[PDB]
Design a protein around this ligand. Structure first.
Ligand code: SAM
Ligand code: SAM
Lengths: 30, 390, 487, 487, 390, 30
DNA sequence: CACGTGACCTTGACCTCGCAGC
DNA sequence: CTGCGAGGTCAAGGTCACGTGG
C-alpha cells in the first residue's frame, strides 16, 4: 500500500497544518 | 518572584484553600467506597481514569482522604510525573491515597480548574525543586510545602475564567499531537511497504534474470567470538570491539573500546548482523574491528550487493527476530533464502530505496522536531497564561 | 612594545580622514579600506624577506607597494592609477599559487577607496609611515585595528554575522586551555576568530625557539566562507600577528565528513547562528538537516582528534539547545561520544546589536561518555533588561564565571570540593535528566525564579507552521519520487 | 397619693432651717430632729385612735403633742419648755414596758433641738402642718425621709454602719420574694431595714382585707442594738408605714441559739461586718468566736423555720467568704444544712464612704443540701476603679443582675435553659470544689483576668499577727486555768 | 489584660522558650536512664523527690521526653494539682513522662526559676481554666495551650531576680506552716492528756468515794434497729432517724430525715455511741429521735453524769475502736468498766473539763484560721510579685 | 503531761510569732 | 474515689520491595 | 535492571480507661 499510505499521510499533514493555523488564528489576540 | 498586572496578588497556595477532612472507611466496614490512588490517574491528561471501589472492611492503610467535586489532588511522591487530577462530581466526598495533597479551592478566591492548570504546569513543581532539596535523593515532599509554594492569584476571579480560554488552545494542541503520533507511526511503515514490493515473498517466481539463492552461496560468514578481558583497552591497541547491538549506531557502530589481540575481525564493508537477542539487527562496518559472539559478520560475495543484502535483512528483521533463548547460527544464516537479481539491477534498486530512505528520514526528523516544539508550545502557553499575556 | 604614540594617533587620524570622505559611509568602510592598504604593504614586506632567501616576484615592479606608494602623486593621477591600473592588475594575476588567492580577495564588489584622491593619498601615506620591521609599530596597528573591529561590532548590525564579543572569546580560550602544539580550529572563523586569542595565549607560554615556529607555522588551522570577514580576518592574524597564517576561503560544509582525515586537538568556535543551506551540501553529513548550525556541530564533532583530552569551546544559540529531532540525535551522539563538561547560559543581547538571541557557551570534552554537566547562568547588571549596543558585555561578568568554573574544573578531576563551584547562579545537572528532557540542554536554574522567559506562543506556532509546510513539501517529494521510479 | 409638691417642699424648707441652725451640724442632725418630732406626733395620733377604742393615758394631757405644739409660743418659752419640762418628762415615763420604750428612746443621750427657739418653733409648725389622717401626706413625708436617709448614707461615714444602699435592698427582697404571711426577720436591722421594702412588695400583692392586718401586725419581726438607728428606723417603718411595728432595742446576740424558739419563714438582712463581741455573748453559740458576723450567721441559720422553702437574702463581707477556721465550720454546716443557691459579688465601694470593702449578696435556700451555686460578678462602670460617694451604686447594674438571675432561677427548678443564666459575668460553681478550697466562697470568675485583687501582703501579715498573739493570750489562759484548778 | 510597669512586656509563654527534644531510650537498650513521672513529684514543694532509674530496654511508652537543667516540667494532666518542678543538674538531659510540658527558658529573655514560680502560681493554671475547659469534664490540656497562655515577662531581667525576694519570703512562710502543723498536732493531745489525768487506767486504786462499776450497772442500753424503707420521709413524720456516725455533728446530730414509724427511740439526753465502724464515736442527743443499727443509745442512770460518761467515752475512743468486721454488742457496752465518783464531784470535773475543752476549741479554730490565711498570704505574695509591687 | 505540753506548745507559738514579725519586718519594703 | 500510667488511636512522614517497563 | 508507588513501619502527640493507693 506504499503509495496509498503517503496519500493518507499527506491528508493527515495538511489537516494538522489546518489545525495549527487555527491555533495561530486564535492566538492573536497577542 | 516577578512582575504583576494590577489586579493580581501573590498568595501562598494554602491561603487559598479550605480545610480538608480525612476519614477511616473501616469504621463503616460493610459500606463500599471508591478509592483513588496514583496508579488510578492518567499522567498525560491529568484525569482519574481507573478508581477501584472497595468494601470499607478491606480498605488499605493509605485510604484516608476525602476528595470532593472540584478538589485538585496532587501526588506528593515524585510530583514531576504530573499525577494531578480534578475530582469529578461522581467522586465527590471520597477517599484517595494519602500520597496525595488535597486542594479544596474556596470559590471566594480561586476557581478550582485554574488551580488544576496551575499545578499541571511546571511552575509549582519547580517551586518544589527550588525548595526542599535541589538535587537531594528523596522522591517526595510534605503536603504543607505544597501548601507553602507561592502562586499568583488574579482578582477577579474572572481571569480564572480566562483559563477557561486556555482550555480551547490546549484542546486543539493535544489534538495536533494525536495526529502527529499516528502520522509518525504510519510514516515508518512506509519504508517496510516499499520493501514489501521489491522483495518477493518466498516461493513466488521472480522477474527474469533473478534467482532464489541460499545466503551461504552468495555470502560467507564469520561467526565471531569474545576474547579474554585482558585484551580490552582504551589506549587504542589492536582493533575496536563490538559485542552486540548495544554497540550499534543507526548506520555505523561507534567504537568505544579496543582489543589488543583480536580473534575474529570484520573488514570494512562487511555487514554486521546481531546474532543474539535482540537478534537480526543490522549495522554496517565502516572500519576494521573485532566482533564478539553477540555479533556475526556477513561478508558478501560478488553477485551480492552489501546494500541489497542490508535492505533485505531490514525487510526480514521482524520475524528474522524469533520471539529457548534467542541465538542464530552460521548454518541458520547460510540457509536463509535471498532473491538475487543481476548486480547492476541490485544497485539500481539500491539507489531508489536509498532516496526513499533519505526522504523518510528527513521526514521522521522533521515531525519529531514538530512534536518537541509542540511540547515547548504547551509550556509557552502556560508560562504566557499565568502572566497577563494570554 | 606599544609606542602607539604618534603612530596610534595617526591611524586614528586616518579614520577621521575617511569619516570626512564620501565613499566611506561608516566604520565598516574605514576598516576594510585600511585592511586592503595594510595587506598590500604586508605582502610586499613578506616578499622582501623572500628576496633575502632568493639570495641563497609575486607582482612586480610597477605594482609593488614600494614603487607606487613611495611616489608623490598628483591626487587625480593617484586615484586614476589605483582604479585604472592597480586594482585591475590585482584582479588578474592568474598564478596557480596564492596569486589566484589574491584575486579571490580582490574578487568582488567595492574595494573601498576614497572619493577624494587627496584623502586617499593622505591615508596611503599614513599607512606607509608604519615601520613593518618594528613589531612595536605592528603591535600598535594591531591594537587600533582591534578597537576598530570592536566599534564596528557595536555600530553595525550586519556584523553581527562575522563578529563575536572579545570577552566571550577570551573566556572560551581561557577555559579550553590550548597548548603547543595542538592544532586550533574554527570551522567558521568570522574575521579574526578565536585564533588570535589562542595565539597570544599559547605565545604567553612560548618558552623556546622551536616553539615559536610551531606557533606561526603549524598551530593555526581554521576557515571562513564569506569574502569580507575572510579578508578582514586575514589582515588581523597577520597584524597581531602570524607571518603566514593558513586559512582558506572555502565552505566547511562542502567537505564530506565521513572521509575525515583532517583532525585537530582543539576547536574554539562560533559557527553561524542558524539558517538553511540544504540539498547537495546536506549529503556531506550522516544526519541530514537544512539547518547550518547542526551540520557545523556534526563537522566539529568529527573534526576533533581521537586522543583523550580532545576539547571544544563553542558558541550555540537557544535553538541548538532546546530543539528536538535531528538536533536531539546529534546531541545524543554528542553526549555519548563526548563528555560535555560545561554550559554557560549567556543572556539576551550579548550579541546585540546583531541579535539578542540568548546563547550558551558549550565546553565539551572528549575522554569518553558524558556523566554530569556544570551549568553557569550569567547575571545581567540589575539595571538592564538585556545587554545592548549602549551597554555591552564585558570581561567582569566573566570574572565571576571564571572563578566558579575554576571551582568546577577542580571538582571534575576531584582536586577540589564541590561547594566551591556552586552558587545559586551555578548548578550541576545529571546527564540522565537531560535525556528524559528529550536532550533539552537549555539552562534551568533550580534555585531561581520560575519564569523561563519563553517566547510568545505565537512565534512558536509561526515556526511550527513554516516547518509543517516543509513537511508537506517533503511528502509530495516522496510521492513524486515513488510515482516517478515506477516500472 | 404623693401630694409632694405643696408639702414636700416645706419639709425641705425645714431641712434648710436646720442647716441655718448651729446645733444641727449636718444632715444627720436634721434627720434625727425631724425623727423625734414626727415620732411624738405619731404617738399622739395612735392614742387618739385609742380614744376611739376607749369609747367601747399614755402621756399627761399637758405633754401630748396636741396641746403644746398647737399653742403659739414666744420662742424662748418654747425652747425652755422642751428642754426644761418636756424631754425630762419623757424620761419621766415609768409604766408599762412600752413607756419604758418611750423613755428608752429619749433616755439615750441628747435629743436634737434647734439652738434658736424661733427655728425650733418653725420646724415644729412645719411638722404640725402635716395631716396624719391623710395617707397622702404621710406618703410624702415618708418619701422625703427616705431621700434624707439616702443623702445621710452618702455624706456621713459613720452611717455607713447602720445604712445599706436601697438598690441592694430592693434587689435582695426581689430575689427572696416574700409572701404573706411568712414573717420577715432582720436580726440586725439598721434603721429602716429591708423590712420597709419587703412591706411595700408584700403590700403590692395584698388585695384583700385579711391580708392587710397580717401585714400591719404579724409579718414584721426584726431587731436593732444601737439607739439612733433603732429610733430612726422606727420612725421610718411608721412613716411608710406600718401603724405600730414590732422591733425591739436589744442585742440579737443576747439570745441563746439552742433554746431557739423563734423562728421565721424569711430572713432578709445585712448584719454588721462587725468586729469582736467576745466573752459572755460567745457562750450563746455552739461555735464560739469573737467575730460578730459569724455569730450573726449562726443566729440566722437557726432563726429560719424548718419548713421547705425557708429563705435568706443576706449581705456578707470578704472575710466571711475567704476566712477559714470557725468560719469554714459554720460555712460547712450552711452548705450541708442549707441550699445556698446564689452569690452576687459586689464591687468595692458599694458601701462607701462607710467601707469600700468588697461584699457579696448571699441568697441561700433551705429545702436541703447544697449542690450547685450560681455566681454573678457585678460590673463597675469601666470609667470607675471603685464605687464612690460621687458615683454610688444604682438600680441599673442590678437590673442586668436581675435578668441573669431570672435565668438561673428558671434553670434551678428546671423550667429553663442554662444558657440563659450564663454570661462572662455569670458562672456556676459546683459544691465539691468549694469544699476542696476549704470553703472559700469568694468569687473567682473563670472568664476573667487571673488577677484576684488580693490585699497586699503586709495587711495579711498584720491581721495574722494580731490573731497570733490572740492565740498566745488563749494559751496563757489555758495554762493559768490548768494549774489553777489543780487539786 | 493587666497593667504593667515600664520594663515589663507581655509575651506568650512559648515565645520565651527553646525548642525541646524527645528521644527513645529503647534505641539504647542496655543504657540506663533516670525516669521522671508525675508520681515522682512532691506537689507541695514542687520538686522531683523520687525518680526511678530504668534500663533503656524496659522503658515505658510514655518515656520519650528529655529534660535538662533549669527545665520546668509542668504536668498537662490535671494541672491544678501543681505537679510542676524545676529540673536539677543531676537530672540534666533526661527522660520523663509525655504528660509533662517541658519549658526550656532561653536565658536571653527568661531565667527559669521565675518561670517555675509563675507556673507554681494559680496564674497560668487559671489561664488554662479560662481557655480549654471551663467546666468541660476533661482533666488534661495539650502542650501548646501551655505554650499559648499569656504571661508577664519582667525585663529589665535581673529584675526577675526579685525571685530571690519571693523565695526568701516563701521559705519563712512555709516554715511557719510547718510549725503551725506541729502546733496543731500537739494541741490535740492536750485534751486526751487532760483526760488521762482524770480517768485512772483499770485496776488502779481510786480516790475515796469512787468505785469501779460495770457500765450496764449504772447505764441502760437501747441497741437500736433499722426500720423498713417505707417509713423514711422528708415531710417530718414521726421522729428523726440516725443510722450511724455519718449523721453525727461533732456535738449534736443534724436531722435530715424522719421515720414515720420509729422502732427504737432515743430521748433527749441519751448519749449516742456508734456501734459499727467507726465504732466508739459519740454524740449527745438533743431531740427525740429513732436510731438505726449503726447506733446504740446509752441512757445514763441516776448515779452517772451524761457528760461524765461522755468524756470517759472520748477517753476510751482510740481502741474502744478495735481495728471479723467490727460491731459492738449490748453486753459489750454493759461490761465496759467505768470509774464512778460521787455525782457532785462528777459535775465538778465535768465543769473543769468543759472549760478546758472550750479553750482548746477556740484554740483549734484560731490556728486553723491562721493556717488558711497563710495560704491566702502565699497567693497574695505571688499576685503582688507579678506586678511591680514586690 | 498535760501542763508541759501547753508549755512547749506555747514555745512553738512565740517562735511562730517571731518568724512572722520578721516576715512583716522584711515586707516593707513594699 | 480520682489520680496517672499504660494502652490504643490518629496524623503525618519516611522506608522499601514487589512489579512492570527500557 | 531501574524507576514507581502502594504497603508497611515509625514517631509525635492526644485521648481513653483501668489499676490502685490514700
Ligand atoms: C559568528 S561568526 C564566527 C565568529 C568568529 N569566530 C569570530 O568571532 O571572530 C560566523 C562566521 O562564520 C562564517 N560562515 C558562515 N557559514 C560558513 C560556512 N559554510 N563555512 C565557513 N564559514 C562560514 C560567516 O561568514 C561568519 O563570519
Ligand atoms: C449594717 S447594718 C444593717 C443595715 C440595715 N439593714 C439597713 O437597712 O440599713 C447593721 C445594723 O445592725 C445593728 N447591730 C449591730 N450589732 C447588733 C446586735 N448585736 N444585735 C442587733 N443589732 C445589731 C447595728 O446597729 C447596725 O445598725
Amino acid at each position: 500500500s506504499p503509495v496509498e499510505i503517503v496519500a493518507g499521510l499527506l491528508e493527515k499533514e495538511r489537516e494538522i497544518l489546518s489545525i495549527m493555523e487555527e491555533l495561530s488564528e486564535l492566538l492573536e489576540n497577542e | 518572584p516577578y512582575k504583576l498586572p494590577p489586579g493580581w496578588r501573590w498568595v501562598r497556595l494554602g491561603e487559598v484553600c479550605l480545610p480538608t477532612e480525612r476519614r477511616d472507611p473501616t469504621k463503616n466496614p460493610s459500606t463500599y467506597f471508591v478509592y483513588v490512588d496514583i496508579s488510578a490517574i492518567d499522567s498525560t491528561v491529568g484525569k482519574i481514569v481507573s478508581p477501584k471501589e472497595i468494601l470499607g472492611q478491606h480498605a488499605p492503610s493509605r485510604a484516608r482522604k476525602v476528595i470532593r467535586s472540584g478538589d485538585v489532588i496532587f501526588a506528593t511522591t515524585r510530583p514531576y510525573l504530573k499525577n494531578i487530577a480534578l475530582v469529578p462530581p461522581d467522586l465527590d466526598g471520597q477517599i484517595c491515597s494519602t500520597g496525595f495533597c488535597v486542594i479544596r479551592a474556596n470559590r471566594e478566591f480561586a476557581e478550582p480548574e485554574f488551580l488544576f492548570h496551575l499545578c499541571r504546569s511546571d511552575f509549582i513543581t519547580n517551586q518544589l525543586t527550588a525548595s526542599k532539596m535541589r538535587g537531594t535523593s528523596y522522591p517526595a515532599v510534605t503536603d504543607n510545602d505544597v501548601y507553602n509554594t507561592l502562586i499568583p492569584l488574579p482578582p477577579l476571579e474572572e481571569q480564572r475564567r480566562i483559563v477557561a480560554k486556555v482550555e480551547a488552545l490546549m484542546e486543539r494542541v493535544r489534538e495536533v499531537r494525536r495526529l502527529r503520533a499516528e502520522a509518525q507511526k504510519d510514516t515508518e511503515l512506509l519504508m517496510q511497504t516499499a520493501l514489501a514490493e521489491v522483495f518477493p515473498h518466498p516461493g513466488a517466481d521472480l522477474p527474469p534474470g533473478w534467482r532464489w539463492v541460499r545466503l551461504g552461496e552468495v555470502c560467507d560468514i564469520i561467526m565471531g567470538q569474545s576474547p579474554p578481558s585482558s585484551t580490552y583497552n582504551f589506549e587504542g591497541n589492536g582493533l575496536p570491539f563490538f559485542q552486540g547491538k548495544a554497540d550499534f549506531g543507526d548506520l555505523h557502530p561507534t567504537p568505544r573500546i579496543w582489543c589488543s589481540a583480536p580473534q575474529k575481525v570484520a573488514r570494512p564493508g562487511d555487514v554486521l548482523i546481531s546474532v543474539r537477542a535482540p537478534v537480526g539487527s543490522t549495522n554496517v562496518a565502516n572500519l576494521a574491528c573485532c566482533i564478539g559472539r553477540g555479533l556475526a559478520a556477513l561478508r558478501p560475495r560478488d553477485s551480492l550487493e552489501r546494500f541489497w543484502l542490508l535492505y533485505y535483512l531490514h525487510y526480514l528483521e521482524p520475524e528474522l527476530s524469533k520471539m529457548t533463548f534467542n541465538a542464530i547460527t552460521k548454518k541458520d544464516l547460510q540457509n536463509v533464502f535471498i532473491p538475487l537479481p543481476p548486480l547492476e539491477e541490485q544497485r539500481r534498486i539500491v539507489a531508489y530505496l536509498d532516496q526513499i530512505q533519505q526522504q523518510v528520514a528527513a521526514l521522521k526528523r522533521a515531525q519529531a522536531e514538530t512534536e518537541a516544539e509542540l511540547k515547548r508550545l504547551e509550556q509557552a502557553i502556560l508560562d504566557k497564561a499565568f502572566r497577563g499575556d494570554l | 612594545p606599544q609606542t602607539r604614540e604618534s603612530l596610534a594617533n595617526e591611524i586614528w587620524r586616518a579614520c577621521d580622514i575617511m569619516r570626512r570622505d564620501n565613499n566611506c559611509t561608516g566604520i565598516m568602510e574605514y576598516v576594510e579600506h585600511l585592511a586592503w592598504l595594510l595587506f598590500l604593504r604586508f605582502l610586499d614586506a613578506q616578499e622582501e624577506e623572500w628576496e633575502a632567501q632568493a639570495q641563497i616576484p609575486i607582482i612586480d615592479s610597477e605594482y609593488r607597494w614600494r614603487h607606487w606608494a613611495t611616489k608623490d602623486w598628483p591626487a587625480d593621477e593617484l586615484l586614476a592609477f589605483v582604479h585604472g591600473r592597480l586594482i585591475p592588475y590585482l584582479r588578474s594575476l592568474g598564478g596557480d599559487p596564492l596569486r589566484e588567492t589574491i584575486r579571490s580577495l580582490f574578487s568582488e564588489r567595492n574595494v573601498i577607496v576614497c572619493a577624494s584622491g587627496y584623502n586617499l593619498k593622505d591615508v596611503i601615506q599614513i599607512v606607509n609611515e608604519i615601520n613593518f620591521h618594528s613589531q612595536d609599530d605592528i603591535f600598535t596597528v594591531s591594537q587600533v585595528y582591534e578597537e576598530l573591529l570592536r566599534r564596528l561590532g557595536n555600530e553595525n548590525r550586519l556584523a553581527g554575522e562575522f563578529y563575536t564579543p572579545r570577552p566571550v572569546v577570551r573566556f572560551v580560550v581561557e577555559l579550553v586551555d590550548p597548548q603547543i602544539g595542538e592544532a586550533v580550529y574554527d570551522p567558521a572563523c568570522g574575521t579574526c576568530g578565536f585564533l588570535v586569542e589562542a595565539y597570544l595565549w599559547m605565545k604567553q607560554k612560548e618558552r623556546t625557539i622551536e616553539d615559536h615556529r610551531i606557533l606561526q607555522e603549524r598551530t593555526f588551522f581554521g576557515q571562513e566562507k564569506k569574502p569580507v570577514p575572510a579578508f578582514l580576518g586575514l589582515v588581523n592574524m597577520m597584524l597581531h600577528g602570524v607571518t603566514v597564517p593558513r586559512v582558506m576561503r572555502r565552505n566547511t560544509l562542502e567537505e564530506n565528513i565521513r572521509n575525515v582525515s583532517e583532525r585537530f586537538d582543539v576547536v574554539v568556535t562560533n559557527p553561524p547562528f542558524g539558517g538553511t543551506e540544504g540539498r547537495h551540501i546536506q549529503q556531506n553529513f550522516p544526519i541530514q538537516s537544512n539547518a547550518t548550525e547542526l551540520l557545523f556541530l556534526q563537522h566539529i564533532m568529527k573534526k576533533l582528534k581521537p586522543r583523550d583530552g580532545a576539547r571544544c569551546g563553542m558558541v550555540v544559540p537557544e535553538g541548538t539547545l532546546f530543539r528536538g529531532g535531528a538536533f536531539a540525535e546529534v546531541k545524543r551522539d554528542l553526549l555519548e561520544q563526548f563528555n560535555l563538561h560545561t554550559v554557560v547560559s549567556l543572556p539576551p543581547g550579548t550579541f546585540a546589536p546583531y541579535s539578542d538571541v540568548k546563547t550558551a557557551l558549550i565546553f565539551f570534552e572528549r575522554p569518553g561518555p558524558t556523566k554530569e554537566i556544570w551549568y553557569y547562568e550569567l547575571p545581567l547588571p540589575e539595571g538592564l533588561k538585556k545587554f545592548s549596543k549602549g551597554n555591552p558585555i564585558q570581561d567582569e561578568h566573566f570574572e565571576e564565571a571564571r572563578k566558579l568554573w575554576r571551582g568546577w574544573d577542580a571538582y571534575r578531576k576531584g582536586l577540589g570540593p564541590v561547594e566551591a563551584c556552586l552558587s545559586e547562579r551555578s548548578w550541576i545537572v545529571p546527564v540522565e535528566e537531560v535525556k528524559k528532557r528529550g536532550y533539552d540542554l537549555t539552562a534551568r536554574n533550580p534555585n531561581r525564579s520560575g519564569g523561563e522567559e519563553l517566547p510568545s506562543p505565537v512565534e512558536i506556532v509561526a515556526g511550527l507552521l513554516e516547518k509543517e509546510r516543509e513537511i508537506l513539501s517533503i511528502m509530495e517529494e516522496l510521492s513524486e519520487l515513488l510515482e516517478n521510479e515506477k516500472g
